Amino acid sequence: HAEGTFTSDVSSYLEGQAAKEFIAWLVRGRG
Ligand SMILES: *C(=O)CC[C@H](NC(=O)CCCCCCCCCCCCCCC)C(=O)O
């Protein structure tokens, strides 16, 4: 019985992975 991945990911969600992933689209083809 062990814990799952979160202690680390909890620090990345602050920036947004999947969501913000879109920011790359606009920035890379929107002026
Ligand atoms: C994090 O990604 C949550 C944001 C969330 N999703 C979206 O906004 C989807 C984007 C579609 C809207 C049209 C694009 C405008 C985005 C511009 C934001 C600044 C990025 C520019 C970087 C140089 C939401 O809040 O709707």
Side-chain angles (χ1 to χ4, degrees):
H1 220 68
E3 269 252 26
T5 263
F6 249 117
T7 182
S8 218
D9 200 75
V10 287
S11 210
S12 81
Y13 91 77
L14 291 98
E15 313 251 54
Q17 291 258 229
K20 241 51 53 195
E21 210 297 279
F22 78 69
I23 193 177
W25 124 67
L26 41 105
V27 177
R28 297 164 101 276
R30 196 187 179 77

